[PDB]
Amino acid sequence: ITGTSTVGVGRGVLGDQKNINTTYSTYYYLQDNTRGDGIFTYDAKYRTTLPGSLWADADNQFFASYDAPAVDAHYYAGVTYDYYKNVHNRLSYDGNNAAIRSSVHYSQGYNNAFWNGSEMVYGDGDGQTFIPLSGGIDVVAHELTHAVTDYTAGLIYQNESGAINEAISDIFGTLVEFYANKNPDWEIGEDVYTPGISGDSLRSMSDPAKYGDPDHYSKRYTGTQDNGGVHINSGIINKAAYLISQGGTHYGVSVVGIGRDKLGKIFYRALTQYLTPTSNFSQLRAAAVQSATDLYGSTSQEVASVKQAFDAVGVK
Ligand SMILES: CC(C)C[C@H](N)C(=O)NO
Ligand SMILES: [Ca+2]
Numbered sequence: 001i002t003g004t005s006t007v008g009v010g011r012g013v014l015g016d017q018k019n020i021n022t023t024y025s026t027y028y029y030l031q032d033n034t035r036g037d038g039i040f041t042y043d044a045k046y047r048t049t050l051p052g053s054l055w056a057d058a059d060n061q062f063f064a065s066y067d068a069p070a071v072d073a074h075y076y077a078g079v080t081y082d083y084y085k086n087v088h089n090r091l092s093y094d095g096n097n098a099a100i101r102s103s104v105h106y107s108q109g110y111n112n113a114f115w116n117g118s119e120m121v122y123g124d125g126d127g128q129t130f131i132p133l134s135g136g137i138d139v140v141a142h143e144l145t146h147a148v149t150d151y152t153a154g155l156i157y158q159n160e161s162g163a164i165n166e167a168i169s170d171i172f173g174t175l176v177e178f179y180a181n182k183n184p185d186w187e188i189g190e191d192v193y194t195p196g197i198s199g200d201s202l203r204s205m206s207d208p209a210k211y212g213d214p215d216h217y218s219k220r221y222t223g224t225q226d227n228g229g230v231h232i233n234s235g236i237i238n239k240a241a242y243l244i245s246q247g248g249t250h251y252g253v254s255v256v257g258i259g260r261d262k263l264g265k266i267f268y269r270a271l272t273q274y275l276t277p278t279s280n281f282s283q284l285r286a287a288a289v290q291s292a293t294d295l296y297g298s299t300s301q302e303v304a305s306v307k308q309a310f311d312a313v314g315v316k
């Protein structure tokens with residue numbers, strides 16, 4: 001829409017208040033003009049038809065409960081774009097400031113969120129397994145990161161290249177969560193998952209086994225569901241990513257941790273410079289070691305800890 005940029009206030013899914021960038025043209029629109037070519041939030045109105053309608057509000061106040069998911073989808077897209085741009089110097093997920101579009105209230109009691117190749121979609125949950133998914137910033141950055149992969153390595157969604165795809169998104173969704181200082185952890189979806197249980201989460205990076213995910217290559221899942229287990233085998237790469245950053249002894253293998261700043265940067269480089277659409281876990285390791293070596297040198301500690309962590313997980 002063409003209009004004047006302004007700022008509005010709303011309450012998020014968790015009941016937290018915030019300011020969001022909007023646009024004024026008779027109605028106040030969930031259109032942010034300050035980031036790239038902008039961020040657009042739509043109302044899917046409980047249908048499956050996308051994107052649906054650009055969100056329109058009459059007073060610039062988004063305190064209704066129906067408003068909660070649009071607020072968070074919109075804002076959280078905004079800090080993710082910021083993290084990318086400030087930390088890896090990337091403009092938007094394509095590297096060129098493309099517009100970010102998000103649709104909220106998709107279907108009825110849809111327990112999930114996704115990147116469909118051109119926009120982000122968020123269900124509202126059944127209200128028991130999940131609450132509106134845009135409420136989790138790690139969910140929101142996990143999804144945007146899928147855009148980012150699609151435009152860089154392009155990892156096909158299945159088997160090992162697809163588990164690497166899902167672990168990238170979970171690694172940067174977690175870096176984004178730490179980036180915002182929004183109560184960070186090494187957990188996924190904890191904030192929107194099972195409103196009645198406490199302390200649980202979708203997946204764990206620190207201990208993928210908590211919830212049954214392999215934490216070792218020898219545990220790798222070989223069937224067929226979940227596209228050859230894209231969301232299962234991703235735990236092997238999450239565990240490795242977790243050890244490099246924090247350090248630890250996994251299966252008798254000791255890793256000195258180099259911290260998260262450096263984990264973000266050796267991964268963003270592997271992802272943008274050496275990963276290909278068909279890369280497998282042995283190729284990710286070569287790529288991570290090669291990036292670590294590019295940045296810190298051949299004989300660095302950083303180079304040594306990425307080797308150690310892939311060795312602890314049994315990758316190669
Ligand atoms: C993990 C969910 C919260 C979202 C879906 N599971 C996914 O990988 N989207 O990318
Ligand atoms: Ca209003």
Ligand SMILES: [Ca+2]
Nearest residue numbers: 182183184185
């Ligand atoms: Ca958290």
Ligand SMILES: [Ca+2]
Nearest residue numbers: 138185187188
């Ligand atoms: Ca988390």
Ligand SMILES: [Ca+2]
Nearest residue numbers: 193194197200
């Ligand atoms: Ca819970």
Ligand SMILES: [Zn+2]
Nearest residue numbers: 142146166169
């Ligand atoms: Zn995903």
